[PDB]
Amino acid sequence: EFKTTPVDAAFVEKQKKILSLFYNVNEISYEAEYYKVAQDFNIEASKDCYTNMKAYENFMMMYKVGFLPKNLEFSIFYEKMREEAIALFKLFYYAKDFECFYKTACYARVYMNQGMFLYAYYIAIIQRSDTASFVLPAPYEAYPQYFVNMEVKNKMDYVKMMDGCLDEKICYNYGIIKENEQFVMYANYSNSLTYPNNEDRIAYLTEDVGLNAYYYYFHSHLPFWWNSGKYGAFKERRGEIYFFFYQQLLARYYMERLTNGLGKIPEFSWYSPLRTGYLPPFNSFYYPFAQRSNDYELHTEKNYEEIRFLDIYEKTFFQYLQQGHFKAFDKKIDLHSSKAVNFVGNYWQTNADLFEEDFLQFYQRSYEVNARRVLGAAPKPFNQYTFIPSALDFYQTSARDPAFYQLYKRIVQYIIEFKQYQVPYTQEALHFVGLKISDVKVDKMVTFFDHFDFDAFNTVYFSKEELKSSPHGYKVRQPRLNHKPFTVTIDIKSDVATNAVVKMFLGPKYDENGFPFSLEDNWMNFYELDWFVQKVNPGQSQITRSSTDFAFFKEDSLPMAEIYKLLDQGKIPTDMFNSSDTMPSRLMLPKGTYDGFPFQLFVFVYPYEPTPKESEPFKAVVPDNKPFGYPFDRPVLPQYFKQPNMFFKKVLVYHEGELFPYLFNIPH
Amino acid sequence: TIKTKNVDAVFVEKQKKILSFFQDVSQLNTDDEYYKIGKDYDIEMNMDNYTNKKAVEEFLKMYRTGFMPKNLEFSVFYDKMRDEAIALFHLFYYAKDFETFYKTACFARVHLNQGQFLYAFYIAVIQRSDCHGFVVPAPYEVYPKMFMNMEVLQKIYVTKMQDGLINPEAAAKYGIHKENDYFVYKANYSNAVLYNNEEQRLTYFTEDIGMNAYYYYFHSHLPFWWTSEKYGALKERRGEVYFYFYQQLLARYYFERLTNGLGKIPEFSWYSPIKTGYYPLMLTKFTPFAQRPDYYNLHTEENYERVRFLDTYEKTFVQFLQKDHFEAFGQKIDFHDPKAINFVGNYWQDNADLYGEEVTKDYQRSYEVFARRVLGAAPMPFDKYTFMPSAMDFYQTSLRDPAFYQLYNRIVEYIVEFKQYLKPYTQDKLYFDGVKITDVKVDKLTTFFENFEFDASNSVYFSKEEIKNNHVHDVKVRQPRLNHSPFNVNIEVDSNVASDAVVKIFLAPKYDDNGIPLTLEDNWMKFFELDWFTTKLTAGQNKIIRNSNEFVIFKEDSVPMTEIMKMLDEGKVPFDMSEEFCYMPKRLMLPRGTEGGFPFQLFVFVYPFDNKGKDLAPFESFVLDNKPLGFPLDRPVVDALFKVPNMYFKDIFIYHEGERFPYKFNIPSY
Numbered sequence A: 001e002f003k004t005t006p007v008d009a010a011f012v013e014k015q016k017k018i019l020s021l022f023y024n025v026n027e028i029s030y031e032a033e034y035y036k037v038a039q040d041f042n043i044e045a046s047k048d049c050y051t052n053m054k055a056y057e058n059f060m061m062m063y064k065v066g067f068l069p070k071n072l073e074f075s076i077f078y079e080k081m082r083e084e085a086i087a088l089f090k091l092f093y094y095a096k097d098f099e100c101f102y103k104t105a106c107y108a109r110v111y112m113n114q115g116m117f118l119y120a121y122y123i124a125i126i127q128r129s130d131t132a133s134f135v136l137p138a139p140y141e142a143y144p145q146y147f148v149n150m151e152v153k154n155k156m157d158y159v160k161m162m163d164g165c166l167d168e169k170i171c172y173n174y175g176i177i178k179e180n181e182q183f184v185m186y187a188n189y190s191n192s193l194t195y196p197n198n199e200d201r202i203a204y205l206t207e208d209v210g211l212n213a214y215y216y217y218f219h220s221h222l223p224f225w226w227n228s229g230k231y232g233a234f235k236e237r238r239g240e241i242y243f244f245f246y247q248q249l250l251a252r253y254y255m256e257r258l259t260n261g262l263g264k265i266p267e268f269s270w271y272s273p274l275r276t277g278y279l280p281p282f283n284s285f286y287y288p289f290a291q292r293s294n295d296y297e298l299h300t301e302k303n304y305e306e307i308r309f310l311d312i313y314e315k316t317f318f319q320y321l322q323q324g325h326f327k328a329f330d331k332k333i334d335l336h337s338s339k340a341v342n343f344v345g346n347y348w349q350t351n352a353d354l355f356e357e358d359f360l361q362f363y364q365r366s367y368e369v370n371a372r373r374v375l376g377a378a379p380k381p382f383n384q385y386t387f388i389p390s391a392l393d394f395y396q397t398s399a400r401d402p403a404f405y406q407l408y409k410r411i412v413q414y415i416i417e418f419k420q421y422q423v424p425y426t427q428e429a430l431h432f433v434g435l436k437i438s439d440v441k442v443d444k445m446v447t448f449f450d451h452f453d454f455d456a457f458n459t460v461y462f463s464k465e466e467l468k469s470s471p472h473g474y475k476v477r478q479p480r481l482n483h484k485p486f487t488v489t490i491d492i493k494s495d496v497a498t499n500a501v502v503k504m505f506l507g508p509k510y511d512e513n514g515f516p517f518s519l520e521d522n523w524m525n526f527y528e529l530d531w532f533v534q535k536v537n538p539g540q541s542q543i544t545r546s547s548t549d550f551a552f553f554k555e556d557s558l559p560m561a562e563i564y565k566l567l568d569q570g571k572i573p574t575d576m577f578n579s580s581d582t583m584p585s586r587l588m589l590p591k592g593t594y595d596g597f598p599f600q601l602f603v604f605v606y607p608y609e610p611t612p613k614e615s616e617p618f619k620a621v622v623p624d625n626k627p628f629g630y631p632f633d634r635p636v637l638p639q640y641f642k643q644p645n646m647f648f649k650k651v652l653v654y655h656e657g658e659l660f661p662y663l664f665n666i667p668h
Numbered sequence B: 001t002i003k004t005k006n007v008d009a010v011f012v013e014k015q016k017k018i019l020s021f022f023q024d025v026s027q028l029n030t031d032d033e034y035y036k037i038g039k040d041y042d043i044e045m046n047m048d049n050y051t052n053k054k055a056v057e058e059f060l061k062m063y064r065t066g067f068m069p070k071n072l073e074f075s076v077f078y079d080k081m082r083d084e085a086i087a088l089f090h091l092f093y094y095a096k097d098f099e100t101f102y103k104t105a106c107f108a109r110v111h112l113n114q115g116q117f118l119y120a121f122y123i124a125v126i127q128r129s130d131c132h133g134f135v136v137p138a139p140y141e142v143y144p145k146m147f148m149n150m151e152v153l154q155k156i157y158v159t160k161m162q163d164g165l166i167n168p169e170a171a172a173k174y175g176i177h178k179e180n181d182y183f184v185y186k187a188n189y190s191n192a193v194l195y196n197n198e199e200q201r202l203t204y205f206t207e208d209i210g211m212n213a214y215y216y217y218f219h220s221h222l223p224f225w226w227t228s229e230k231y232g233a234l235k236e237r238r239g240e241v242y243f244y245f246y247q248q249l250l251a252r253y254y255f256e257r258l259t260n261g262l263g264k265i266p267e268f269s270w271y272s273p274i275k276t277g278y279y280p281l282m283l284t285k286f287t288p289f290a291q292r293p294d295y296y297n298l299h300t301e302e303n304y305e306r307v308r309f310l311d312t313y314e315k316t317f318v319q320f321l322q323k324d325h326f327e328a329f330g331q332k333i334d335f336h337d338p339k340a341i342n343f344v345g346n347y348w349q350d351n352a353d354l355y356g357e358e359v360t361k362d363y364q365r366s367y368e369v370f371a372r373r374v375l376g377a378a379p380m381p382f383d384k385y386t387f388m389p390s391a392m393d394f395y396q397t398s399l400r401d402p403a404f405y406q407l408y409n410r411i412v413e414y415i416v417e418f419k420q421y422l423k424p425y426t427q428d429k430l431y432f433d434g435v436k437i438t439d440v441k442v443d444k445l446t447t448f449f450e451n452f453e454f455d456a457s458n459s460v461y462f463s464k465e466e467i468k469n470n471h472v473h474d475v476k477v478r479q480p481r482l483n484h485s486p487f488n489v490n491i492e493v494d495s496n497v498a499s500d501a502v503v504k505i506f507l508a509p510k511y512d513d514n515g516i517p518l519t520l521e522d523n524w525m526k527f528f529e530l531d532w533f534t535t536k537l538t539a540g541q542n543k544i545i546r547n548s549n550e551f552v553i554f555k556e557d558s559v560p561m562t563e564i565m566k567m568l569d570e571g572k573v574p575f576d577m578s579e580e581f582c583y584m585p586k587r588l589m590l591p592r593g594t595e596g597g598f599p600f601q602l603f604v605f606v607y608p609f610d611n612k613g614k615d616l617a618p619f620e621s622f623v624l625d626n627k628p629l630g631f632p633l634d635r636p637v638v639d640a641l642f643k644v645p646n647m648y649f650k651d652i653f654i655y656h657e658g659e660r661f662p663y664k665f666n667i668p669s670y
């Protein structure tokens, strides 16, 4: 069903080598290539495999000491682990060419903590300019322990131990099936036993594998601990990107709330109990994931110190706001400019750019890191290498915890407070002389659930014999949200002839009241659907635009088994290649109602100014000097959003078939 | 004996026009001149009759957007309403001459919200130079619903709905009488139906109408959102006026506490419950005010972000104190400099001058604003124009709420922490060479309660017929109010050489709650300025007699608007309403005494008046001296370093005569 890209022979050889490191991630095949290359790899005598000598020797000092042991949980939020992951990434990134890169990777895949390897290896592939174009397995196929609820994981573990189904018919009743000599396990989203509250209404978005992958992808595309100088001109906009990402995400998430009768994201206080608990079905074969009960007191003895830190980190920000202008971190900052937006984002992410340095240093403490440690509820790590995990310890599980949206809602609000310093758009900056939208029409917008498979073979262990054949075929089936394709047609009257930018946004039409939202208090609640350039004709014309073409949404990842078959034909999937860090299509729309749920479609047309000729860290970076989210990057005066080149359309989002996903997983 | 002032027919005309906007405030007379001009008035077409072209256009832009609807409650404490008020004020203030000014008010009365209009208009009349010398009715005549509980209000309403008394004799037992063509309504203070805590002892003060109108006057004279550019060298002393205003008022409040056996205003925490609540019995148009129960948790869900703001505001100040010298707001500040008081006060009020701008902005969040919203215990506003009012949303009701005094005492305490950095005055600074006060003597000081009536007609809605016929002034409210007897202060001064001099008179407590004499060291901020004036000393023996009645810090009671119309037919205007409108009322000068005589003390100070280097007369002739406000008690004191022969401390007692409880004035006789 998917867009393909023709791909030559050199590429296929390289892509295959790359993907082969993601097979049976959790054990070592004594007969696989990677193993022999790892053994043949004298790390000692090959300084000249690397661009950077310092990076080489740095890693060696560390490696003579010792790294995180195999099998333990890896998380980039713990200091010593991060420093080790960064050293290994430096190695991957400074590899002279693809050969040295492969060897290093084989070496690491054999002698190192697998989680740490996967983390570093992912990022390296995305960042190395000679690997820029190659494809990666979806995060749920590489780390399926972070995307599988415990019940399913155990069902698989016991099937492996049994060497298959004793009796097909008991198995069937447990949602276990044979298909083409592969096992398929049906999976429910977790019940009130996992979210002991209203937030369980939404488990089908928060547990969704696309959504969690998406977040993992956004991190790997530009990690907080790294410099953004590789993207040149983009560096001046890093904080802008950080805001936009969370604002969009939270806007999307709030829409799911509204359709499930849920309202505003609750606000919290470090000095008070947090209402909404989280109980994850995940474990690290050592500790189960830390639970957070309902009405959990954040301010208990073990958190006194971290809360102190988080409290000033926030209040320092308030003091910025109060002072208008001030020196911070070298700079003299004036909150009336855009060198400001960037700073503000960088401030809140304590990323490398905030310090003007290449990598985060040992001792520069992160607000997000401690926010997450406090909200995560875990007892304090036992030592350097051993912590008790929580959902907030990983990019791939973060989106599962209600507290995650509460934490980012807090940051995003503080940025909105800053945005009140920004001067609002005027009639002249928004009006498109001689152009008018006369109508917008939209096809029926319909959501629904349907089944989706992935290979979870990575959390299953195989024998020496089986390993010789690199084995898979442990598939998880899950209902996932989705929508039917639709067309937006825009009608435009115009006087003369230029390229135009067409932008589409989705916003709520009413609050939980039933009361119309006014733009003043809604601009933050619009998420972008699309961006494209158009040749405008004199007079009357119609722009037709299908959802399947929307610039900010991707098709589903193919599993490796399918990737391998495409590669066999000279093909790869475009979206996994050209745009992995984009949200999946199926999640484009929030679950509707049979009824039809009322939202609004915002259609913007403005003149196109041919600019930037760049090299993109995200697909959110479109070749335009306008802000991200423009014209909804800042406070609005509602009376300038009546230009003829704007159209707000009421749309209703329908739903079809079963409303509850669990009815998709019932036996006979 | 109401202190008069004569005036010409041109003045009379203008004054009538100003007064018209204060009658029948919530309604419109289709037949009146103001409406005809108002309805039809084209601002854009009259661009050239305004000093400031940008203000006209700023206003036009907002007015095309829509302004607050009629009939909703207006408070300056919310961004959008404030911004509309200010764009309106600017229109009033930049009108080229009176004619344009007048016509603009006409337009604004026709088209804008009543509260927003009255607010802007009142300030305009005070600020406009060509209006200097003109008179405005007391705020209780304009917003009478804000100076009375709902009991009286409902009687007024019932009578109006009936178009009279169905049973004069039954009405009598509710304190309602016809007198002339007036309906007269006796009113109690709220403690007569409500004793929910010890703070209700202080109602005849905190609910007093003059005391409340006085706060409103202070704010209108110089609102926080506006520059003080127009007041000359006041600009360099704004923060000083801010501090002193509250310091004085809190001293006066404190006296009322003392004489009612209550001691010190309690300290609070934005993270803890606040003990004493506030149950308001006022109504507005479509809601009651918000209640704060006792033990209200300031730190609930809804206040999280607010308290984070409030908490950071304070700590920023604390950081200033720790630093001594710092750069902030684009100014180098040194806390050893006594002049820093300008910045300190400006910081706490978050006024326009903190930033050196004409007008404050939404993104410059105010401390006082957010503290008021937190302690008021109202729920989140419904939208930008629909809130639930608490006493602290208005200058005319704030003094009613115990929390009000707790809030400003907190700020004033913080300013006092700054004053710790100031070097105490030495002997040489205070010593008047060759001058000694040899005796002070005071007539008996005695308070009493006494009936006072005001026009409450704006609280009522009138019919078509009545409005046409000007029968629109028939509702009076009578209420016992504190007063004291006039008294003389006799001061015998000795000086070798003749010399021009300043004499200051303060009032202070004698003891704390334990009955230890208060020492200057701890209690120099507990002093209340009663009077200042100059005399000429001569060689030898001097005797200065000063009547309380000539104390310059206080004014006489306002006259009703009704008597001003009568006066204006004689070519007269009430002097104290013209030049002395924003002074504290005279009759509340002394705290309520006790039958046995509660102990206070007078401080009398005499010092040299050799010239007049720096003196204020733009704000008004308050500080005819380059001396700090509240000199010689504007910084901390060391007892030994302080006492000087031209100072004198005299023990006095304040008595009370007649009924001690106001409600005893309001019993019907049988």
Ligand SMILES: *[C@@H]1O[C@H](CO)[C@@H](O[C@@H]2O[C@H](CO)[C@@H](O[C@@H]3O[C@H](CO[C@H]4O[C@H](CO[C@H]5O[C@H](CO)[C@@H](O)[C@H](O)[C@@H]5O)[C@@H](O)[C@H](O)[C@@H]4O)[C@@H](O)[C@H](O[C@H]4O[C@H](CO)[C@@H](O)[C@H](O)[C@@H]4O[C@H]4O[C@H](CO)[C@@H](O)[C@H](O)[C@@H]4O)[C@@H]3O)[C@H](O)[C@H]2NC(C)=O)[C@H](O)[C@H]1NC(C)=O
Binding pocket: A515, A516, B065, B066, B067, B068, B069, B070
């Ligand atoms: C129970 O509760 C409900 C829900 O809260 C209450 O409902 C509220 O009722 C309000 C009326 O009291 C109402 O507000 C009015 O709505 C009018 C219509 O609003 C629409 O249109 C305007 C402008 O018109 C143009 O719009 C389109 C788009 O360009 C054009 O194609 C059209 O052809 C028009 O040219 C838009 O701006 C709005 O967004 C709406 O879509 C308003 O026009 C009207 O505004 C007037 O009043 C303001 C203050 O009074 C004033 O600032 C403004 O300038 C307007 O002035 C006119 O009206 C006054 C009297 O109001 C008149 O004397 C003047 O001469 C002048 O012509 C109102 O604001 C609320 O919309 C509504 N709330 C909701 C959610 O619907 C309900 O009242 C309440 N009932 C009871 C019994 O309590």
Ligand SMILES: *[C@@H]1O[C@H](CO)[C@@H](O[C@@H]2O[C@H](CO)[C@@H](O[C@@H]3O[C@H](CO[C@@H]4O[C@H](CO)[C@@H](O)[C@H](O)[C@@H]4O)[C@@H](O)[C@H](O[C@H]4O[C@H](CO)[C@@H](O)[C@H](O)[C@@H]4O)[C@@H]3O)[C@H](O)[C@H]2NC(C)=O)[C@H](O)[C@H]1NC(C)=O
Binding pocket: B173, B174, B175, B186, B187, B188, B192, B663, B664, B666, B667, B668, B670
């Ligand atoms: C302001 O606040 C003050 C303080 O409360 C109010 O004062 C009260 O006013 C009320 C009602 O107007 C007064 O009540 C009347 O008292 C009358 C006489 O004194 C009493 O003698 C009786 C009878 O034997 C004793 O038993 C009592 O203890 C009293 O001392 C009394 O004649 C009268 O009776 C009327 O009402 C009853 C209802 O049961 C009928 O039976 C009877 O026919 C008659 O109609 C009242 O009860 C009350 O005394 C006042 N309070 C105090 C403390 O003295 C003011 O009214 C308030 N002013 C305003 C304007 O609100």
Ligand SMILES: *[C@@H]1O[C@H](CO)[C@@H](O[C@@H]2O[C@H](CO)[C@@H](O[C@@H]3O[C@H](CO[C@H]4O[C@H](CO)[C@@H](O)[C@H](O)[C@@H]4O)[C@@H](O)[C@H](O[C@@H]4O[C@H](CO)[C@@H](O)[C@H](O)[C@@H]4O)[C@@H]3O)[C@H](O)[C@H]2NC(C)=O)[C@H](O)[C@H]1NC(C)=O
Binding pocket: A173, A174, A175, A186, A187, A188, A662, A663, A665, A666, A667
């Ligand atoms: C994902 O989540 C869904 C929802 O939780 C879950 O669906 C549930 O599945 C169970 C079985 O898997 C199912 O119950 C089975 O129910 C049937 C239907 O029974 C109906 O008719 C009864 C009268 O004849 C009536 O009493 C019932 O209320 C119901 O309407 C029933 O035939 C089965 O009977 C029992 O069989 C078991 C065998 O273990 C015996 O222990 C027992 O003695 C009975 O003979 C059995 O109960 C249940 O109804 C579903 N829940 C809902 C809410 O619809 C999925 O299984 C889960 N899927 C996966 C893959 O995880």
